[PDB]
Write a protein that binds this ligand. Structure first.
Ligand SMILES: *[C@@H]1O[C@H](CO)[C@@H](O)[C@H](O)[C@H]1NC(C)=O
Ligand SMILES: *[C@@H]1O[C@H](CO)[C@@H](O)[C@H](O)[C@H]1NC(C)=O
Length: 1406
């Protein structure tokens, strides 16, 4: 009677009774339940949330806020609420003093309500003090209080409306005004007050809105709506992204990880420190909220099927009051909304934690790379140290979203199995077995398609390299007329790729069959066992449609669990890698005693006493007991035998090498120039200043003194000229010169130079020695350590040190070492001896597949979905069957028809997948054949104007995404779209008012994809573009760690790395928030759809059949996942289909003349005799430029040897290009053997003359293929050419006599042998006309002597119309035609040209 007497002294009003609360046409809570629970639940929530929230606020202060009107009103309303709450308490005390007996509840509930109201006021004050603008706890507390007070208000209004019930006017009016105040407090809690007075973000012009967004705007992610609208209205660039939150900046994230790791390493000082412990301690506090939210979402997920069971029971029962269904549908909608909010908060927390982990790891790795010892860095390679940011920190980034799965997915699986066992008996095993047996099948198939993928990509790389080689040699290919052979070879390689693609297509067909038809298979197995095991097993709507809704939510934790565990093991290997790197021994800072230049301890800037060093503890010491001192300002030299240890003394003095024993000290700033130059990917000028103020006078002085002024003239922009990506054109001497210039401009005290002169010749060498470093140099009043192998500059230098195998042989001035003649005696003697993609792109891709295959695929897909819909409707009918004599009739027929429909769906799914995949390979074949033909038919002009990068990208990446990506996107997009359509048609067929709700909610509010699609695509682009520079900077800083450490520039580079990481996160964060935004909106659409389906089912409960209701609600439960899939796949289609537009881009660019036109085929005159003819010819590179060739008229019979002579840009190479009409003759004409070659199809003539460039290119393949791709000539002719190429003996000396594969461009042969092979090809093709365009100056006087003697013996008969600037080889030619100014000067035999002392003789004298 504890609860019963607590109601009243007589215990008349019961605490809970279905008599009034549930089994009645008008529900209402009994007065005890109101006055106890409806007032204890909000008090309980506030008092349980205060401890944790106060602990969090004490650990999280955002400053201070003024007392504005809003907060003053909220405090005043809180105090008024407490006094009005104690009003009824005082009334009850007065009544008890009056003698009237009253219950304990009236004397306990108001007390707790008043104290919790005062608590709310106090916590609102402390929230103001601690700087929170929109309270989350208060909003939910007020919402709970308003809901409970609303229930009590409805009860009280109903009771008062009774014309016989007693009314307690005092308590009624007190509760009325309490309700009004609570409602106004809730409406005020939605607002936000002024920003904190300590808002340091005032300087920041573009802060992240999340810092100052309301709680409602924060759970719905509304604050990114402006960004997503703008991203569709106009393009988004990096200038528009918001600044990061202070808690996300690397300057606030990296130090905590660094400090925690240092603390644990110190603790371990045995047992190796564990990076997992540090990462956990550092990032778990913000990650446990993820566990809480995930648990809440997992629990709320199962509230769907149970409420569906209740709704089905309500529809079947026709004696239950109508409001029960409305209660159920409201409950379902509320649960779905809460679940979506909680899940997306969980995802946000996980993603932000991953972002922070990535930032911290990148920063810690960067800061460690600058202090790792030389042995540690030399253990690994720079490409593997960079991978610590490239892959090893992205794995931690992505695992944060999957780590929680390891406990959530088993929980979901066990809950689903338990509910299935409760709902449908042990026959659930028949479906869980099919689902568990499915995952080994798809894992095996994934491996079997991974092997096919790698096998196809390895075969595709052959074509890709063949492309990268052929386009590089397009001119010679066009010039020989060999394009058909290479077209055929590429086509064969494409055929191999397409076979592999067909096999992968079969695999993908079976895979999508499994993925689509697994739920039907599970349902069939379960229902078959359940109904066949026992006759009394009756399939009802709550057994079938509750089981399916639970099978769907058991599907996901099983299908994604193997991926999660694989990701965990990969992250384990990642963490071991990072732990090994971060545990490396670091340089001992105090081994090198640095002291300020102001110290007057002694007049020597460098001192050393018995110092020995080594690059590793175990390795033997290199420098042995050196002891020397360098007086301040002296110019000291260290010269000795190479490899004897002179080149390591500077590095030892820079603290690079471990100091085993000794005592050395260096004063002042240190400037260092290493032997291997370090150059950044920035402008030459910025590289020279190395981050200092530009003093124009001093900068000019150092650049002119360092002899850089002639160098900046060659490159376009001068000092402003950016070095580009890793030295666009900088040579070794240029690199050393700019490094030295940076060293001088730094203006340090001691200068350690590791032979900056080595890669520089003597002339400008001695120039810079005199101007910058020597006794007359720029820094002649500084301390300089020189290690160099030069002799002539040694005498000027003050005191000289000679090394011997890591020991100090002797030191002194140069006169003294002349006198004693010690080590330097031998040294001188021996050593010195956009918008939306057009629909026409989709249409032309559909044509590329084939309209027949496309129609077949669409027909099969529609058949699949009609089969599935009819199957679900048939299941509904089966569950609608009656119970007669304890058993259901028609059981066998229902089961058989269900099975038949399912197998029809399965075979149809398999068919449509195979059809679309085969059509995809068909399209991939035709598109590539067309692209190749169009490119190979285009003129050379298009080849020079279009950078080769675009063509290789078009052939590799666009073709790859067309072959592999888009056919699968078609699968998934069609699946999602028609799943959504099927759900909608089911819903609106069961209840046609769904047709009313769908327009104002489906189409209109589904234009939220118009913004996400436009904006996320831009944001991911920015993310990748900003992701690359972080790794670029890490590599660039790893290359030059010693230089940075010498100049004391560690802070600058750490700050730059921080900026690069922050710029990448600036684009990464909006992408995550955008995903959350779209997910919230789409799941809101789905929740509303399920609400309306259930609500119209409740309205039409008297006409629906209790099986249609379950079907509609079950499909509505899936609508949300289908919508998310559809939007994501629509975006992934839009951003990826443009590859088809790109692959057909050159389908209309102007092509060459018709290759082979057979209407006027010529006779077999051939060029043999070597005739040359021109009739007022004229050619020009591009018609807007100047005519390089003007009015050439000549007609000479064959059998002659004429060379062509001219000055720079005279018209020689243009004539060579115009010989084979490779450029269309604007004016004039050329006729050979009475054939107008300017008209006939160029293939019909290009094979019937010959030409060879300066360096004729070879190809990756057999020497037989290079000599003849058609291989029509007999191998005896091959050997003929080889002997006339002076190679038969050498070629036979190769392992393969005739088919020895030759590398690209003749790499398998030396450059001299390469030109020998080019001569070999030239002769081998049975040729007449040959040319050496500038080749005379690039070939040594022995091999070109061979080629000349061949023109005397082999091309004695052949006609050579060449251009040799070293025409001394061709003076013996019968005649020479001299041309200049783009026109013919004169002609004749070389004799009278010599005697006339003319222009030709003027170049002859040169
Ligand atoms: C609900 O209340 C009374 C209380 O005894 C119960 O006997 C009866 O079944 C119900 N009476 C109504 C609805 O009048
Ligand atoms: C529920 O309400 C009906 C109608 O008043 C009544 O006949 C029935 O006895 C009640 N059944 C239960 C279990 O409360």
């Amino acid at each position: 009677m504890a609860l019963r007497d607590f109601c009243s002294v007589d215990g008349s009003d019961l605490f809970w009774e279905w008599n009034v609360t549930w089994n009645t046409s008008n529900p209402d809570f009994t007065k005890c339940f109101q006055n106890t629970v409806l007032v204890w639940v909000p008090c309980s929530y506030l008092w349980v949330c205060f401890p944790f929230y106060f602990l969090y606020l004490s650990h999280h202060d955002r400053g201070y806020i003024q007392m504005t009107h809003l907060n003053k009103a909220k405090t005043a309303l809180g105090f008024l609420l407490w006094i009005v709450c104690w009003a009824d308490l005082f009334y009850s005390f007065w009544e008890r003093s009056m003698g009237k007996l009253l219950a304990p509840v009236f004397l306990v509930s108001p007390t707790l309500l008043g104290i919790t109201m005062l608590l709310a006021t106090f916590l609102i004050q402390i929230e103001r003090r601690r700087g929170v603008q929109s309270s989350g706890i208060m909003l939910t507390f007020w919402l709970i209080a308003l809901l409970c007070a609303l229930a009590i208000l409805r009860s009280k209004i109903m009771t008062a409306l009774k014309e016989d019930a007693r009314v307690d006017v005092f308590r009624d009016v007190t509760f009325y005004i309490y309700f009004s105040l609570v409602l106004i407090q809730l409406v005020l809690s939605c607002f936000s007050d002024r920003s904190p007075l300590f808002s340091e973000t005032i300087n920041d012009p573009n802060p992240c809105p999340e810092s100052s967004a309301s709680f409602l705007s924060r759970i719905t992610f509304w604050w990114i709506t402006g960004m997503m609208v703008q991203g569709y209205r106009q393009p988004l660039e990096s200038t528009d992204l918001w600044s990061l939150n202070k808690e996300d900046t690397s300057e606030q994230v990296v130090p905590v990880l660094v400090k925690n790791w240092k603390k644990e390493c110190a603790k371990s000082r045995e047992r190796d420190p564990s990076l997992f412990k540090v990462l956990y301690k550092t990032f778990g506090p913000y990650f446990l909220m993820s566990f809480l939210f995930k648990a809440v979402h997992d629990l709320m997920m199962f509230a769907g099927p149970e409420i569906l069971k209740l709704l089905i029971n309500f529809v079947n029962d026709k004696k239950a009051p109508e409001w029960q269904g409305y209660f159920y549908t409201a409950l379902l909608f509320i649960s779905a909304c809460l679940q979506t909010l909680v899940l997306h908060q969980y995802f946000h927390i996980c993603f932000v934690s991953g972002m922070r982990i990535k930032t911290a790891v990148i920063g810690a790795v960067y800061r460690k790379a600058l202090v790792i010892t030389n042995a540690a860095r030399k253990s690994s390679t720079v490409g593997e140290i960079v991978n610590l940011m490239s892959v090893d920190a992205q794995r931690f980034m992505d695992l944060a979203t999957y780590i929680n799965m390891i406990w959530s997915a088993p929980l979901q699986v066990i809950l689903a199995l338990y509910l299935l066992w409760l709902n449908l008996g042990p026959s659930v095993l028949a479906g869980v077995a099919v689902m568990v047996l499915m995952v080994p099948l798809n894992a095996v198939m994934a491996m079997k398609t991974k092997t096919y993928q790698v096998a196809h990509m390895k075969s595709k790389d052959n074509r890709i390299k063949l492309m990268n080689e052929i386009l590089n040699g397009i001119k010679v290919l066009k010039l020989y007329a060999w394009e058909l052979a290479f077209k055929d070879k590429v086509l064969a390689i494409r055929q191999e790729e397409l076979k592999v693609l067909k096999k992968s297509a079969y695999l993908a067909a079976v895979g999508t069959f499994t993925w689509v038809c697994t739920p039907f298979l599970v349902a069939l197995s379960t229902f078959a066992v359940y109904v066949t095991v026992d006759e009394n097993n009756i399939l009802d709507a709550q057994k079938a449609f509750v089981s399916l809704a639970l099978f769907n939510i058991l599907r996901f934790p099983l299908n994604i669990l193997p991926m999660v565990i694989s990701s965990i093991v990969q992250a384990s290997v990642s963490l071991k890698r990072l732990r090994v790197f971060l545990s490396h021994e670091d340089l001992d800072p105090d081994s090198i005693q640095r002291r300020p230049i102001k110290d007057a301890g002694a007049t020597n800037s460098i001192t050393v006493k018995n110092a020995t060093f080594t690059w590793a503890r175990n390795d033997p010491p290199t420098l042995h007991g050196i002891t020397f001192s360098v007086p301040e300002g002296s110019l000291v030299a260290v010269v000795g035998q190479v490899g004897c240890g002179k080149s390591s003394l500077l590095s030892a003095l820079l603290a690079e090498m471990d100091k085993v024993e000794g005592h050395v000290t260096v004063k002042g700033s240190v400037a260092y120039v290493p032997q291997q130059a370090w150059i950044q990917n920035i402008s030459l000028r910025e590289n020279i200043l190395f981050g200092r103020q530009l003093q124009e006078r001093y900068y000019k002085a150092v650049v002119e003194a360092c002899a850089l002024l002639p160098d900046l003239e060659i490159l376009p922009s001068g000092d402003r000229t950016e070095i580009g990506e890793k030295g666009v054109n900088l040579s070794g001497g240029q690199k050393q010169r700019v490094s030295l210039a940076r060293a001088v401009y730094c203006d340090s005290d001691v200068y350690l130079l590791d032979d900056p002169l080595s890669a520089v010749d003597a002339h400008v060498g001695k120039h810079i020695f005199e101007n910058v470093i020597g006794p007359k140099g720029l820094l002649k009043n500084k301390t300089r350590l020189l290690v160099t192998h030069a002799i002539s500059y040694l005498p000027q230098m003050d005191v000289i040190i000679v090394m011997s195998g890591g020991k100090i042989s002797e030191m002194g001035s140069y006169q003294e070492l002349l006198a004693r003649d010690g080590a330097f005696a031998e040294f001188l003697r021996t050593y010195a001896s956009t918008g939306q993609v057009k629909l026409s792109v989709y249409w032309d891709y559909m044509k590329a597949i084939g309209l027949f295959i496309s129609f077949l695929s669409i027909f099969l897909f529609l058949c699949n979905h009609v089969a599935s819909l009819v199957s679900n409707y048939w299941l509904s009918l089966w569950t609608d069957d009656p119970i007669v004599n304890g058993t259901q009739e028609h059981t066998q027929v229902r089961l058989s028809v269900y099975g038949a429909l399912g197998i029809s769906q399965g075979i149809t799914v398999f068919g449509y997948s195979m059809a679309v995949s085969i059509g995809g390979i068909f399209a991939s074949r035709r598109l590539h054949l067309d692209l190749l033909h169009n490119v190979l038919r285009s003129p050379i002009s298009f080849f020079e104007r279009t950078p080769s990068g675009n063509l290789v990208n078009r052939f590799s990446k666009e073709l790859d995404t067309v072959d592999s990506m888009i056919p699968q996107v078609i699968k998934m997009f069609m699946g999602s779209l028609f799943n959504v359509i099927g759900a909608c048609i089911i819903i609106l067929l069961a209840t046609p008012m769904a047709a009313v709700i769908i327009p104002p909610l489906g189409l209109i509010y589904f234009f939220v994809q118009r913004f996400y699609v436009a904006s996320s695509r831009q944001l991911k682009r920015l993310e990748s573009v900003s992701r690359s520079p972080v790794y670029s900077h890490f590599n660039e800083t790893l290359l030059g760690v010693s230089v940075i450490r010498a100049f004391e520039e560690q802070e600058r580079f750490i700050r730059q790395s921080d900026l690069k990481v922050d710029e990448n996160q600036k684009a990464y964060y909006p992408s995550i928030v955008a995903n959350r935004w779209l997910a919230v909106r789409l799941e809101c659409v789905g929740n509303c759809i399920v609400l309306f389906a259930s609500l119209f089912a409740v309205i039409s409960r008297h006409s629906l059949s209790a099986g249609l209701v379950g079907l509609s609600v079950s499909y509505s439960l899936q609508v949300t996942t289908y919508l998310n899939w559809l939007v994501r796949m629509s975006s992934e289609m839009e951003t990826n289909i443009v590859a088809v537009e790109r692959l057909k881009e050159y389908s209309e660019t102007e092509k060459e003349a018709p290759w082979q036109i057979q209407d006027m085929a010529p006779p077999k005159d051939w060029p043999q005799v070597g005739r040359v003819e021109f009739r007022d010819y004229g050619l020009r590179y591009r018609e807007d430029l100047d005519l390089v060739l003007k009015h050439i008229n000549v007609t000479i019979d064959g059998g002659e040897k004429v060379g062509i002579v001219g000055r720079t840009g005279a018209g020689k190479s243009s004539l060579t290009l115009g010989l084979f009409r490779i450029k269309e003759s604007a004016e004039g004409e050329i006729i050979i053997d009475d054939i107008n070659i300017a008209k006939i199809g160029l293939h019909d003539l290009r094979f019937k003359i010959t030409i060879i460039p300066q360096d004729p290119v070879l190809f990756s393949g057999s020497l037989r293929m290079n000599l003849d791709p058609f291989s029509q000539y007999s191998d005896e002719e091959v050997w003929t050419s080889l002997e006339l190429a002076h190679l038969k003996g050498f070629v036979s000396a190769l392992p393969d006599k005739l088919n020895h594969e030759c590398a690209e461009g003749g790499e398998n042969l030396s450059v001299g042998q390469r030109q020998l092979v080019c001569l070999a090809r030239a002769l081998l093709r049975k040729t007449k006309i040959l040319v050496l365009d500038e080749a005379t100056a690039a070939v040594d006087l022995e091999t070109d002597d061979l080629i000349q003697s061949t023109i005397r013996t082999q091309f004695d008969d052949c006609t050579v119309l060449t251009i040799a600037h070293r025409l001394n080889t061709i003076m013996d030619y019968t005649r020479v035609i001299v041309l200049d100014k783009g026109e013919i000067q004169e002609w004749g035999s070389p004799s009278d040209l010599l005697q006339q002392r003319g222009l030709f003789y003027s170049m002859a004298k040169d």
